[PDB]
């Protein structure tokens, strides 16, 4: 029956959708971004600390 015609549900669905867009934007994306940043920082720290340890062992032997 002319299902292509929109209905009041259009508003209601939007509401529900926005609710999810709240949660997903409040307690999913921020923690995941923080965790990925922490992982990148941890990897950079590991590499830099390995390089620093090699450098400082070389200096200690030289010193």
């Amino acid at each position: 029956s002319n299902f292509l015609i929109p209905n009041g549900t259009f508003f209601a669905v939007l509401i529900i959708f926005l609710i999810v867009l709240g949660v997903i934007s409040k307690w999913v994306v921020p923690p995941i971004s923080k965790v990925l940043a922490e992982r990148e920082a941890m990897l950079a720290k590991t590499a830099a600390d390995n390089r620093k340890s090699a450098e400082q062992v070389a200096a200690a032997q030289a010193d």
Binding site: D49, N50, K52, A54, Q56, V57, A59
Partner: protein, 61 residues
């Protein structure tokens, strides 16, 4: 109800195909990522220990 039985057998075969062919590889990929992150953590701890030992040696000299 007959169509319900037909589609029930259909979902049975769908689940068989899934848990037979798709589940193993995706579980393998997730396990690989888990172990990669675990190894990254272990390597970070090892690098920290190496840096501490380097500081100890610097103190020795």
């Amino acid at each position: 109800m007959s169509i319900f039985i037909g589609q029930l057998i259909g979902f049975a075969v769908i689940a068989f195909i899934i848990v037979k062919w798709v589940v193993p590889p995706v579980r393998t990929l997730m396990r690989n990522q888990q172990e990669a992150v675990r190894a990254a953590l272990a390597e970070s701890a090892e690098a920290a220990k190496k840096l501490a030992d380097a500081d100890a040696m610097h103190a020795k000299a």
